[PDB]
Design a protein around this motif. Structure first.
Motif, PDB file in Angstrom:
ATOM      1  N   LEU A 199      -0.170  -5.819   9.368  1.00 18.22           N
ATOM      2  CA  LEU A 199       0.327  -4.802   8.456  1.00 18.22           C
ATOM      3  C   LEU A 199       1.467  -4.011   9.101  1.00 18.22           C
ATOM      4  O   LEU A 199       1.384  -3.629  10.267  1.00 18.22           O
ATOM      5  CB  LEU A 199      -0.805  -3.841   8.066  1.00 18.22           C
ATOM      6  CG  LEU A 199      -0.450  -2.797   7.014  1.00 18.22           C
ATOM      7  CD1 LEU A 199      -0.253  -3.485   5.665  1.00 18.22           C
ATOM      8  CD2 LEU A 199      -1.552  -1.711   6.937  1.00 18.22           C
ATOM      9  N   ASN A 239       0.830  -1.175   0.000  1.00 14.70           N
ATOM     10  CA  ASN A 239       0.000   0.000   0.000  1.00 14.70           C
ATOM     11  C   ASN A 239       0.875   1.239   0.000  1.00 14.70           C
ATOM     12  O   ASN A 239       1.994   1.230   0.511  1.00 14.70           O
ATOM     13  CB  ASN A 239      -0.893   0.026   1.229  1.00 14.70           C
ATOM     14  CG  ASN A 239      -2.372  -0.124   0.882  1.00 14.70           C
ATOM     15  OD1 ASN A 239      -3.079   0.808   0.347  1.00 14.70           O
ATOM     16  ND2 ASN A 239      -2.870  -1.291   1.212  1.00 14.70           N
ATOM     17  N   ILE A 264      -2.558   3.801  -3.400  1.00 17.62           N
ATOM     18  CA  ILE A 264      -2.505   2.506  -4.064  1.00 17.62           C
ATOM     19  C   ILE A 264      -2.467   1.367  -3.053  1.00 17.62           C
ATOM     20  O   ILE A 264      -1.867   1.494  -1.980  1.00 17.62           O
ATOM     21  CB  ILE A 264      -1.245   2.423  -4.951  1.00 17.62           C
ATOM     22  CG1 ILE A 264      -1.381   3.364  -6.165  1.00 17.62           C
ATOM     23  CG2 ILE A 264      -0.964   0.987  -5.393  1.00 17.62           C
ATOM     24  CD1 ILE A 264      -0.071   3.697  -6.822  1.00 17.62           C
ATOM     25  N   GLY A 265      -3.131   0.263  -3.400  1.00 16.02           N
ATOM     26  CA  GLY A 265      -3.134  -0.936  -2.569  1.00 16.02           C
ATOM     27  C   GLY A 265      -2.970  -2.157  -3.472  1.00 16.02           C
ATOM     28  O   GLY A 265      -3.013  -2.030  -4.703  1.00 16.02           O
ATOM     29  N   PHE A 314       4.053   7.077   2.758  1.00 18.97           N
ATOM     30  CA  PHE A 314       4.248   5.868   3.551  1.00 18.97           C
ATOM     31  C   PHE A 314       3.813   4.648   2.760  1.00 18.97           C
ATOM     32  O   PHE A 314       2.756   4.657   2.137  1.00 18.97           O
ATOM     33  CB  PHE A 314       3.399   5.922   4.828  1.00 18.97           C
ATOM     34  CG  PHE A 314       3.921   6.863   5.871  1.00 18.97           C
ATOM     35  CD1 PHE A 314       4.897   6.456   6.774  1.00 18.97           C
ATOM     36  CD2 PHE A 314       3.409   8.148   5.979  1.00 18.97           C
ATOM     37  CE1 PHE A 314       5.359   7.320   7.750  1.00 18.97           C
ATOM     38  CE2 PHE A 314       3.873   9.018   6.955  1.00 18.97           C
ATOM     39  CZ  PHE A 314       4.845   8.603   7.838  1.00 18.97           C
ATOM     40  N   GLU A 374       0.765  11.698   3.100  1.00 12.79           N
ATOM     41  CA  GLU A 374       0.497  12.596   4.217  1.00 12.79           C
ATOM     42  C   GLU A 374       0.863  14.035   3.864  1.00 12.79           C
ATOM     43  O   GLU A 374       2.018  14.347   3.633  1.00 12.79           O
ATOM     44  CB  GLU A 374       1.246  12.160   5.485  1.00 12.79           C
ATOM     45  CG  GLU A 374       0.860  12.974   6.725  1.00 12.79           C
ATOM     46  CD  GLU A 374       1.892  12.906   7.835  1.00 12.79           C
ATOM     47  OE1 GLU A 374       2.837  12.125   7.726  1.00 12.79           O
ATOM     48  OE2 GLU A 374       1.751  13.634   8.823  1.00 12.79           O
ATOM     49  N   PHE A 411      -4.142  12.659   5.580  1.00 18.10           N
ATOM     50  CA  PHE A 411      -3.772  11.400   4.959  1.00 18.10           C
ATOM     51  C   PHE A 411      -4.746  10.971   3.860  1.00 18.10           C
ATOM     52  O   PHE A 411      -5.952  11.106   4.010  1.00 18.10           O
ATOM     53  CB  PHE A 411      -3.680  10.290   6.006  1.00 18.10           C
ATOM     54  CG  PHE A 411      -2.530  10.438   6.946  1.00 18.10           C
ATOM     55  CD1 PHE A 411      -2.631  11.265   8.051  1.00 18.10           C
ATOM     56  CD2 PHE A 411      -1.347   9.760   6.725  1.00 18.10           C
ATOM     57  CE1 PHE A 411      -1.565  11.389   8.946  1.00 18.10           C
ATOM     58  CE2 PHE A 411      -0.276   9.884   7.610  1.00 18.10           C
ATOM     59  CZ  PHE A 411      -0.394  10.694   8.708  1.00 18.10           C
ATOM     60  N   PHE A 441       4.050  -0.623   8.512  1.00 14.07           N
ATOM     61  CA  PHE A 441       4.354   0.594   7.749  1.00 14.07           C
ATOM     62  C   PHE A 441       5.850   0.826   7.619  1.00 14.07           C
ATOM     63  O   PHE A 441       6.628   0.533   8.538  1.00 14.07           O
ATOM     64  CB  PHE A 441       3.736   1.833   8.416  1.00 14.07           C
ATOM     65  CG  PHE A 441       2.268   1.943   8.245  1.00 14.07           C
ATOM     66  CD1 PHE A 441       1.411   1.351   9.160  1.00 14.07           C
ATOM     67  CD2 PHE A 441       1.716   2.656   7.188  1.00 14.07           C
ATOM     68  CE1 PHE A 441       0.043   1.457   9.013  1.00 14.07           C
ATOM     69  CE2 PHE A 441       0.347   2.769   7.048  1.00 14.07           C
ATOM     70  CZ  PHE A 441      -0.494   2.171   7.962  1.00 14.07           C
ATOM     71  N   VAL A 482       0.392   5.411   0.996  1.00 16.02           N
ATOM     72  CA  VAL A 482      -0.468   6.425   1.589  1.00 16.02           C
ATOM     73  C   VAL A 482       0.281   7.759   1.642  1.00 16.02           C
ATOM     74  O   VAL A 482       1.489   7.801   1.879  1.00 16.02           O
ATOM     75  CB  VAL A 482      -0.901   6.020   3.003  1.00 16.02           C
ATOM     76  CG1 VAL A 482      -1.550   7.203   3.716  1.00 16.02           C
ATOM     77  CG2 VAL A 482      -1.867   4.805   2.945  1.00 16.02           C
ATOM     78  N   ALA A 484      -6.684   3.595  -5.814  1.00 18.86           N
ATOM     79  CA  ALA A 484      -7.996   3.829  -5.230  1.00 18.86           C
ATOM     80  C   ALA A 484      -8.734   4.766  -6.175  1.00 18.86           C
ATOM     81  O   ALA A 484      -8.107   5.545  -6.883  1.00 18.86           O
ATOM     82  CB  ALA A 484      -7.851   4.471  -3.858  1.00 18.86           C
ATOM     83  N   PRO A 485     -10.054   4.661  -6.222  1.00 18.88           N
ATOM     84  CA  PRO A 485     -10.830   5.528  -7.091  1.00 18.88           C
ATOM     85  C   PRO A 485     -10.630   6.999  -6.748  1.00 18.88           C
ATOM     86  O   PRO A 485     -10.598   7.376  -5.580  1.00 18.88           O
ATOM     87  CB  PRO A 485     -12.270   5.106  -6.803  1.00 18.88           C
ATOM     88  CG  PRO A 485     -12.165   3.640  -6.459  1.00 18.88           C
ATOM     89  CD  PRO A 485     -10.748   3.385  -5.959  1.00 18.88           C
ATOM     90  N   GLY A 544       9.000   3.671   7.161  1.00 22.37           N
ATOM     91  CA  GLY A 544       9.267   4.901   7.923  1.00 22.37           C
ATOM     92  C   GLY A 544       8.783   6.186   7.250  1.00 22.37           C
ATOM     93  O   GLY A 544       8.782   7.260   7.867  1.00 22.37           O
ATOM     94  N   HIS A 552      -1.736  16.976   9.045  1.00 20.84           N
ATOM     95  CA  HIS A 552      -2.193  15.605   9.284  1.00 20.84           C
ATOM     96  C   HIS A 552      -3.283  15.170   8.304  1.00 20.84           C
ATOM     97  O   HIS A 552      -4.299  14.586   8.708  1.00 20.84           O
ATOM     98  CB  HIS A 552      -2.726  15.484  10.721  1.00 20.84           C
ATOM     99  CG  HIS A 552      -1.656  15.516  11.770  1.00 20.84           C
ATOM    100  ND1 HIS A 552      -0.331  15.263  11.490  1.00 20.84           N
ATOM    101  CD2 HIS A 552      -1.721  15.736  13.104  1.00 20.84           C
ATOM    102  CE1 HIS A 552       0.374  15.332  12.605  1.00 20.84           C
ATOM    103  NE2 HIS A 552      -0.445  15.614  13.599  1.00 20.84           N
ATOM    104  N   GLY A 611      -5.204   7.572   0.952  1.00 20.89           N
ATOM    105  CA  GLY A 611      -4.718   6.322   0.387  1.00 20.89           C
ATOM    106  C   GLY A 611      -4.553   6.493  -1.120  1.00 20.89           C
ATOM    107  O   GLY A 611      -5.386   7.111  -1.768  1.00 20.89           O
TER     108      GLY A 611
END
Lengths: 122, 108
Positions: B97, B35, B49-50, B88, B39, B45, B99, B37, B56-57, B101, B43, B47
């Motif tokens: 899952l 994935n 790609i997964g 990230f 940022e 955030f 993450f 994500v 993601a749409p 760094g 703050h 998403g």
């Protein structure tokens, strides 16, 4: 139209517990998982776990097994996370983030985050 | 398992830049369902790609995911000023899952 609205900032004593909320809207609540993620300065992001609002099935980061409890309330389209036996290590910003898992996986919408400060009553 | 990303990368507007995600256990596979994500300041955030390469749409097409060699990669084709942010990656390890760094991307 999709929104993940988290509860307001929290200030709690060491040793106590706290329940954070994540109110979902603009989509079929039960169609997406809900992850919870912990953010602390210099420590990037840390996965807590996720819950399937359809049945409330959970999968946790073994580090948070005894710390976090994930639940949901279908009717109010709200996901909750309780954190227990609080210490300064628990002070962080917490997010909820939905994930599509049917045929493929992906995060998309994230909550705005809720700040938690574990502070001793002077 | 520990996940590693570049600490910080610099690119220029319109250029193509590639961010990577490393698994300490060995090569990243499709079973790690990588994935990505983003940022942004305050703050914020989102998403991207997964499942390695599934956008993601609503995510800009300029963001694409793949496996390059032993790692998962996020390619930004034609970087925009607004793309300056922290990225990230997170890999799935058969129950949990993890993450990376995060990578601070600067767009000159």
């Amino acid at each position: 139209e999709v929104q993940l609205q988290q509860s307001g900032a929290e200030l709690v004593k060491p040793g106590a517990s706290v329940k954070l909320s994540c109110k979902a809207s603009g989509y079929t609540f039960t169609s997406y998982w809900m992850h919870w993620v912990k953010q602390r300065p210099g420590r990037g992001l840390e996965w807590i776990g996720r819950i399937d609002p359809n049945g409330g099935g959970t999968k946790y980061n073994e580090k948070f097994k005894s710390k976090a409890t994930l639940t949901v309330d279908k009717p109010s389209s709200t996901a909750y996370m309780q954190l227990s036996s609080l210490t300064s290590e628990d002070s962080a910003v917490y997010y909820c983030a939905r994930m599509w898992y049917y045929g493929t996986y992906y995060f998309d919408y994230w909550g705005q985050g809720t700040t938690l400060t574990v502070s001793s009553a002077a | 398992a520990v996940v590693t990303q570049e600490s910080a990368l610099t690119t220029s507007p319109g250029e193509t830049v590639t961010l990577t995600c490393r698994s300490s256990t060995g090569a990243v596979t499709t079973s790690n369902y990588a994935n990505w994500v983003q940022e942004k300041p305050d703050h914020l955030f989102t998403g991207l790609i997964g499942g390695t390469n599934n956008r993601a749409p609503g995510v800009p097409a300029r963001f694409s995911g793949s496996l390059i060699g032993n790692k998962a990669a996020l390619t930004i084709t034609g970087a925009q000023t607004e793309d300056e942010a922290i990225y990230f990656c997170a890999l799935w390890y058969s129950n949990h899952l993890v993450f990376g760094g995060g990578t601070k991307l600067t767009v000159l």
